[PDB]
């Protein structure tokens, strides 16, 4: 991790580098432990490792530096449950934490829910994919960078 004034300690230099290189409209994926990171990163995005971190910690740190797009219906998206899981009535409480962290970063929008394969399509066009140690089911979240001022 990095040691610079005003920069969250949990950010690695490679992640900071990725955030700095991203432009307006670019997206970054914070992937859970079960995400097919290896295959997705074969299609374009840079792979960044964050093995010992959970997503809530990382998300909070990223939002301290990353301005979110305010012109899209929602600058943050998660993967919606697959049919089997919806039928089973699966609960995904981690999403409540995401909504809370976004609010604290001044983002009043609600998370967008994308169908599995539609989520995978977006991930392939992402600038980078951060492989975390998040074990929560459906913990993946995609963020879209906006402009400053």
- Nearest residue to 76 (alpha-carbon basis) of 144, 28, 147, 148: 144
Rule CB under 8 A: say whether 56 interacts with a second copy.
Answer: no
Rule CB under 6 A: say whether 112 interacts with ligand FUC.
Answer: no
Closest to a second copy by CB, 19 vs 111, is: 19
Going through 44-137 in order, the beta strands assigned E by DSSP cover: 46-50, 76-79, 112-114, 128-132
65 Cβ contact list (under 8 Å, min separation 6): 7, 8, 11, 16, 19
Report, in Å, the least distance between residue 60 CB and a second copy. 13
Beta bridge partners of 131: 31, 49
Question: How many residues make up the chain in this entry?
Answer: 149
Closest to ligand FUC by CB, 17 vs 92, is: 92
Among 34, 36, 64, 96, binds a second copy (CB under 8 A): 64
Mapped onto helix, strand or coil, the DSSP state of residue 91 is coil
Q: Which stretch binds a second copy (CB under 8 A): 1-9, 27-35, 91-99, 129-137?
A: 1-9
Q: Residue 59: count other Cβ atoms within 10 Å of its Cβ.
A: 24
Query: Would you please indicate which residues are annotated as catalytic (active-site) residues?
Result: 24, 69, 120
| Interacting residues toward ligand FUC by CB under 6 A | 32, 34-35, 79, 82, 137-140
Tell me the binding residues for substrate. Answer: 32, 79, 120, 138, 140
| Interacting residues toward a second copy by CB under 8 A | 2-7, 13-14, 16-17, 19-21, 23-24, 64-67, 147-148
């Amino acid at each position: 991790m990095v040691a610079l004034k005003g920069i969250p300690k949990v950010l690695s230099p490679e992640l900071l580098f990725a955030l700095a290189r991203m432009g307006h409209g670019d997206e970054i994926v914070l992937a859970d432990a079960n995400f097919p990171t290896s295959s997705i990163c074969q299609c374009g995005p840079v792979e960044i490792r964050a093995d010992g971190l959970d997503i809530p910690q990382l998300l909070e740190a990223v939002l301290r530096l990353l301005p979110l797009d305010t012109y899209v219906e929602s600058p943050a998206a998660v993967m919606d449950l697959v049919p089997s899981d919806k039928e089973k009535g699966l609960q995904t409480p981690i999403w409540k934490r995401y909504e809370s962290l976004l609010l604290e970063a001044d983002c009043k929008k609600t998370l967008m829910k994308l169908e599995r394969f539609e989520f995978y399509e977006r991930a392939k066009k992402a600038f980078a994919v951060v492989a975390t140690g998040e074990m929560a089911l459906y913990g993946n979240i995609i963020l879209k960078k906006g402009t400053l001022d």
